[PDB]
Design a protein around this ligand. Structure first.
Ligand SMILES: O=c1ccn([C@H]2C[C@H](O)[C@@H](COP(=O)(O)O)O2)c(=O)[nH]1
Length: 285
């Protein structure tokens, strides 16, 4: 039944069999295919959270709420027990990236800052940016409500002028939205995805975001197109993914929202209910 997860497993199988063996910017071995595409149904509450290996759903939600706040302070995420950005905000990493002037936790003008304040001058995570720069997230919700057929509904973190200030240039580079049949769909352009850890997390994240926007706009959800540039498996993850490929997918979970959620800024951890998520165990990578 879960044909959509079967497609992710086929992408991993295709990469292992046909990918090129290349060392990345760190000197770490990868197996890579440039240019891959997959579609996931979001209909009837479905969020494409992989069942063949547990996805860090708590991390997905807290990260997304922290993006929506426009927050770039890794400590605010770490304080909810989500440490995924902590390495990139560490005194050691900041100094290595020539950000010696930044406070620990300051990731620079990454996703949250771009989504809510695109074009504003970044002056550190502790600065108040209220009403500074372009609120892309507000703008795309305005377009979906007022001009649902627009070909111009883009959320982009790839701010060229800001790339040098970021802890990391964005892997999930831009997302286009469209409405058909009163159904909101999303196409995510991901320049770089590790099939082991990153890509499943990112699929859950953009699936959830599309549902949250659809909810606040009074729309059903259609599909998520996932477009990859460098689709890769780290050499030291090959055995873990060969393990995952032996597993048969279960049905994807569904999401529903509780409370009086009127705007994108009103979602809380507690307002987001994930239903029937029973994955096989996380695999050690
Ligand atoms: O949301 C994210 C963040 C990172 N990565 C992975 C992809 C790469 O393996 C690495 C980023 O390295 P570059 O592509 O920037 O070299 O992290 C993802 O897959 N998703």
């Amino acid at each position: 039944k879960n044909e959509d997860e079967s497609k992710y497993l086929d992408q991993v199988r295709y990469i292992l069999k046909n990918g090129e063996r290349i060392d990345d910017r760190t000197g770490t071995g990868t197996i890579s295919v440039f240019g891959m595409h997959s579609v996931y149904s979001l209909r009837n509450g479905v969020v494409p959270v992989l069942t063949t290996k547990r996805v860090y759903w708590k991390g997905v939600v807290e990260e997304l709420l922290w993006f929506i706040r426009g927050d770039t302070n890794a400590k605010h995420l770490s304080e909810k027990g989500v440490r995924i950005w902590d390495a990139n905000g560490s005194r050691q990493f900041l100094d290595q990236c020539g950000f010696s002037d930044r406070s620990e936790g300051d990731l620079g003008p990454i996703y949250g800052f771009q989504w809510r304040h695109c074009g504003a001058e970044y002056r550190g995570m502790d600065t108040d940016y209220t009403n500074q720069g372009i609120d892309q997230l507000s703008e795309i919700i305005d377009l979906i409500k007022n001009e649902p057929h627009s070909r111009r509904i883009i959320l982009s973190a790839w701010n060229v002028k800001d790339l040098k200030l970021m802890a990391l240039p964005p892997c999930h580079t831009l997302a286009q939205f469209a409405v058909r049949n009163g159904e909101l769909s999303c196409q995510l352009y991901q320049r770089s995805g590790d099939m082991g850890l990153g890509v499943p997390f990112n699929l859950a994240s953009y699936g959830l975001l599309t549902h949250m926007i659809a909810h606040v706009c009074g729309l059903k959800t259609g599909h998520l197109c996932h477009v990859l540039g460098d689709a890769h498996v780290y050499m030291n993850h090959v055995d873990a993914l060969q393990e995952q490929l032996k597993r048969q997918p279960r049905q994807f979970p569904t999401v529903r929202f509780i409370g009086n959620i009127k705007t994108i800024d009103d979602f809380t951890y507690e307002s987001i209910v994930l239903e029937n998520y029973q994955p096989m165990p996380a695999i050690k990578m």
